[PDB]
Amino acid sequence: AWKEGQFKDIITKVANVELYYRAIQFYLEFKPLLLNDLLMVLSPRLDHTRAVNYFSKVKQLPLVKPYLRSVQN
Amino acid sequence: PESIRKWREEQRKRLQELDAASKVMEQEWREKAKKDLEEWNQRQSEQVEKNKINNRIAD
Amino acid sequence: HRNLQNLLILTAIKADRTRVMEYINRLDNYDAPDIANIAISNELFEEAFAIFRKF
């Protein structure tokens, strides 16, 4: 049932913003490479504090280093 | 002929097989993700060591 | 911001979560002293401190 394009398109049209964290967790469990691609489009509709908190909890800070270069503004 | 028995049993067996197949696929995907993470962390450590060596040889 | 600040800032204050910092860092063209006094009236004082530091 999973597909890259369909998920990338429907992730922006959801209402419950809490599903973003669960999707990030499931991707880190399955496809950690797509985490940056998901964060590139989910950056407006997602909090930046809880994301880095979870990344520091799971010890995955340098994995999202290129993503942090587009949020310094 | 009261085929509801097989109707339920065959479908239940097929679902039990598909669930096991999906669990095996998910475990294989998790193992591949862990292998990718281990491959990336090693390269990150090598890059950190190379940067440390370059900063040491700067002076 | 016509009757729209309380719909985002005051509603977030009722929850007492870290979303208030993101809302402050994202919302623009608002009223600083009003939300500052609203935060001071509540238990959250760090948000009013950050607002006063911004201006």
XYZ file of C-alpha atoms in Angstrom, chain C residues 8-50:
43
model
C -3.812 31.661 17.321
C -1.926 33.131 20.291
C -4.601 33.016 23.000
C -5.760 29.572 21.860
C -2.167 28.338 22.143
C -1.830 29.869 25.617
C -4.820 27.780 26.736
C -2.819 24.654 25.833
C 0.472 25.683 27.518
C 2.726 23.997 24.962
C 5.902 24.852 23.056
C 3.842 25.748 19.965
C 3.638 29.344 21.227
C 7.308 29.937 20.390
C 6.801 28.692 16.827
C 3.655 30.806 16.470
C 5.576 33.891 17.623
C 8.448 33.087 15.249
C 6.009 32.587 12.336
C 3.198 35.114 12.833
C 3.795 38.656 11.567
C 1.886 41.961 11.559
C 0.499 41.423 15.068
C 0.179 43.397 18.310
C 3.114 42.865 20.663
C 1.964 44.606 23.898
C -1.487 42.990 23.835
C -0.217 39.408 23.615
C 2.584 40.328 26.031
C 0.074 41.433 28.676
C -2.064 38.365 27.932
C 0.943 36.110 28.549
C 1.891 38.024 31.708
C -1.659 37.496 32.979
C -1.139 33.751 32.466
C 1.479 31.446 33.982
C 3.754 31.625 30.909
C 6.224 34.494 31.360
C 9.104 33.403 29.107
C 7.016 34.183 26.016
C 6.461 37.770 27.164
C 10.194 38.026 27.881
C 11.001 36.862 24.347
